[PDB]
Design an enzyme around this catalytic site. Structure first.
Site, PDB file in Angstrom:
ATOM      1  N   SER A   1     -25.338  83.358  80.521  1.00 52.61           N
ATOM      2  CA  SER A   1     -26.721  82.894  80.777  1.00 52.61           C
ATOM      3  C   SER A   1     -27.696  83.509  79.780  1.00 52.61           C
ATOM      4  O   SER A   1     -27.563  84.694  79.415  1.00 52.61           O
ATOM      5  CB  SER A   1     -27.150  83.265  82.197  1.00 52.61           C
ATOM      6  OG  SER A   1     -26.249  82.645  83.115  1.00 52.61           O
TER       7      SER A   1
ATOM      8  N   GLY B   1     -17.173  78.713  95.549  1.00 56.70           N
ATOM      9  CA  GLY B   1     -15.824  79.213  95.322  1.00 56.70           C
ATOM     10  C   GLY B   1     -15.831  80.208  94.182  1.00 56.70           C
ATOM     11  O   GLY B   1     -16.829  80.883  93.960  1.00 56.70           O
TER      12      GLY B   1
ATOM     13  N   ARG C   1     -32.145  81.349  83.129  1.00 54.67           N
ATOM     14  CA  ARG C   1     -30.881  81.632  83.842  1.00 54.67           C
ATOM     15  C   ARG C   1     -29.976  80.398  83.921  1.00 54.67           C
ATOM     16  O   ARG C   1     -28.764  80.528  84.161  1.00 54.67           O
ATOM     17  CB  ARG C   1     -31.162  82.193  85.237  1.00 54.67           C
ATOM     18  CG  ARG C   1     -31.820  81.181  86.175  1.00 54.67           C
ATOM     19  CD  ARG C   1     -32.096  81.761  87.589  1.00 54.67           C
ATOM     20  NE  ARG C   1     -32.792  80.699  88.324  1.00 54.67           N
ATOM     21  CZ  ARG C   1     -34.098  80.475  88.217  1.00 54.67           C
ATOM     22  NH1 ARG C   1     -34.816  81.274  87.450  1.00 54.67           N
ATOM     23  NH2 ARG C   1     -34.687  79.463  88.853  1.00 54.67           N
ATOM     24  N   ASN C   2     -30.566  79.212  83.754  1.00 54.08           N
ATOM     25  CA  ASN C   2     -29.802  77.958  83.752  1.00 54.08           C
ATOM     26  C   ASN C   2     -29.505  77.367  82.380  1.00 54.08           C
ATOM     27  O   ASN C   2     -29.066  76.207  82.262  1.00 54.08           O
ATOM     28  CB  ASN C   2     -30.486  76.933  84.634  1.00 54.08           C
ATOM     29  CG  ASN C   2     -30.455  77.351  86.086  1.00 54.08           C
ATOM     30  OD1 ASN C   2     -29.539  78.056  86.505  1.00 54.08           O
ATOM     31  ND2 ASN C   2     -31.486  76.966  86.855  1.00 54.08           N
TER      32      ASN C   2
ATOM     33  N   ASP D   1     -35.051  72.540  87.739  1.00 55.56           N
ATOM     34  CA  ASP D   1     -34.660  73.966  87.797  1.00 55.56           C
ATOM     35  C   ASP D   1     -34.429  74.503  86.369  1.00 55.56           C
ATOM     36  O   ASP D   1     -33.516  75.303  86.115  1.00 55.56           O
ATOM     37  CB  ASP D   1     -33.404  74.126  88.679  1.00 55.56           C
ATOM     38  CG  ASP D   1     -33.187  75.580  89.203  1.00 55.56           C
ATOM     39  OD1 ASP D   1     -34.107  76.445  89.157  1.00 55.56           O
ATOM     40  OD2 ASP D   1     -32.060  75.845  89.677  1.00 55.56           O
TER      41      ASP D   1
ATOM     42  N   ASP E   1     -26.500  73.703  85.090  1.00 52.86           N
ATOM     43  CA  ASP E   1     -26.941  73.685  86.481  1.00 52.86           C
ATOM     44  C   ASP E   1     -27.631  72.408  86.915  1.00 52.86           C
ATOM     45  O   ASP E   1     -28.848  72.348  87.160  1.00 52.86           O
ATOM     46  CB  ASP E   1     -27.775  74.908  86.841  1.00 52.86           C
ATOM     47  CG  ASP E   1     -27.825  75.140  88.371  1.00 52.86           C
ATOM     48  OD1 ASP E   1     -28.179  76.261  88.799  1.00 52.86           O
ATOM     49  OD2 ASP E   1     -27.479  74.212  89.142  1.00 52.86           O
TER      50      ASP E   1
ATOM     51  N   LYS F   1     -14.442  76.282  87.641  1.00 57.72           N
ATOM     52  CA  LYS F   1     -14.970  76.653  88.950  1.00 57.72           C
ATOM     53  C   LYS F   1     -14.108  75.986  89.976  1.00 57.72           C
ATOM     54  O   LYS F   1     -13.708  74.846  89.766  1.00 57.72           O
ATOM     55  CB  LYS F   1     -16.402  76.132  89.138  1.00 57.72           C
ATOM     56  CG  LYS F   1     -17.435  77.010  88.425  1.00 57.72           C
ATOM     57  CD  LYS F   1     -18.858  76.644  88.815  1.00 57.72           C
ATOM     58  CE  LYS F   1     -19.183  75.162  88.592  1.00 57.72           C
ATOM     59  NZ  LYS F   1     -20.639  74.941  88.913  1.00 57.72           N
TER      60      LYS F   1
ATOM     61  N   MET G   1     -18.769  79.112  77.280  1.00 58.98           N
ATOM     62  CA  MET G   1     -19.983  79.621  76.621  1.00 58.98           C
ATOM     63  C   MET G   1     -19.882  81.126  76.613  1.00 58.98           C
ATOM     64  O   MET G   1     -20.148  81.796  77.640  1.00 58.98           O
ATOM     65  CB  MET G   1     -21.265  79.137  77.355  1.00 58.98           C
ATOM     66  CG  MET G   1     -21.354  77.590  77.424  1.00 58.98           C
ATOM     67  SD  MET G   1     -21.636  76.814  75.827  1.00 58.98           S
ATOM     68  CE  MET G   1     -23.393  77.147  75.597  1.00 58.98           C
TER      69      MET G   1
ATOM     70  N   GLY H   1     -15.964  86.665  88.911  1.00 55.42           N
ATOM     71  CA  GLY H   1     -16.638  86.698  90.223  1.00 55.42           C
ATOM     72  C   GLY H   1     -16.736  85.385  91.002  1.00 55.42           C
ATOM     73  O   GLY H   1     -16.028  84.407  90.716  1.00 55.42           O
TER      74      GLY H   1
END
Length: 281
Positions: A104, A31, A148-149, A144, A162, A51, A100, A26
């Protein structure tokens, strides 16, 4: 010590002939996101996350995109995501990081509700604390830190990711950082307490869908997230300690690592258990 960039100082320029793309995962902020393989100079081949920067990017997008690599590249620790390098001399520009397999941590745990042992969960938590201890040692405040990070690999090792938001998310942020932007390693310790709750809750959302205004007011009034089902007393106490109102009373990351190591060494201590509503502390 971390140095604020806000780069080739801290990132290797990779030769794209050494990168192959295997799978597209995705889109990201800047990008596409994919995975593949990287051939190292020694000829060893490893899996990597890749990425790319979108075609027709703005100069600000390029700076923000690569800025993450200039931060990540400063760290070399088993619980911080490794930067393998960047491609900047050809386009699309790419950032290449360690692969990984399990993605997440929050989405991974939601798929496996109540399926891990308490010792497995504590091992995950210890890795996260160890990575944070290094970042805080380097003078970096993450800002942060959230499940999720954190990314988790095939062997369940958890690693901080992140780097977009910090330097030398209301639900994860300490009251003083909300009130007047007082961000310190102690506000990261608060966030760590939230991640501890997320892990022990198998990826439940902190404060569920409470109005942001109420999350702020409730926490200020002394209310805290309640113990996760079957949560060891020692771990709920650790959450409460991370969530002290007075930031000077929170444990340091080194102390958190030490606490977790003692639990790993004496797993019987985890057998003492605590007995969608917040609890007044």
């Amino acid at each position: 010590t971390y140095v604020d960039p806000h780069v080739h100082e801290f990132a290797k320029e990779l030769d794209a002939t050494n990168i192959s793309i295997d799978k597209v995962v995705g889109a990201g902020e800047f990008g596409e996101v994919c995975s593949g393989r990287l051939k190292l100079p020694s000829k060893k081949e490893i899996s990597v996350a890749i990425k790319t920067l979108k075609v027709g990017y703005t100069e600000k997008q390029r700076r923000d995109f690569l800025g993450e690599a200039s931060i990540m590249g400063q760290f070399d620790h088993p619980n911080i995501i490794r930067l393998e390098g960047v491609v900047t001399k050809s386009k699309p520009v790419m950032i290449v990081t360690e692969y990984m397999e399990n993605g997440s941590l929050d989405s991974f745990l939601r798929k496996h509700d109540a399926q891990f042992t308490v010792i497995q969960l504590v091992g995950m938590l210890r890795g996260i604390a160890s990575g944070m201890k290094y970042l805080s040692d380097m003078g970096y405040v993450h800002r942060d830190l959230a499940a999720r990070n954190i990314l988790i690999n095939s062997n369940l090792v958890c690693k901080v990711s992140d780097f977009g938001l910090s330097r030398v998310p209301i639900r994860w942020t300490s009251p003083e950082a909300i009130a007047y932007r007082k961000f310190t390693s102690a506000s990261d310790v608060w966030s760590y307490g939230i991640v501890l709750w997320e892990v022990m809750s198998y990826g439940e959302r902190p404060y569920w869908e409470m109005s942001n205004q109420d999350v702020i007011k409730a926490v200020d009034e002394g209310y805290r997230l309640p113990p996760p089902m079957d949560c060891p007393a020692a771990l709920y106490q650790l959450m409460l300690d991370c969530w002290q109102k007075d930031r000077n009373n929170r444990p340091k990351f080194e102390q958190i690592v030490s606490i977790l190591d003692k639990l790993i060494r004496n797993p019987g201590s985890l057998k003492i258990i605590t007995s969608s509503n917040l609890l007044l502390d």
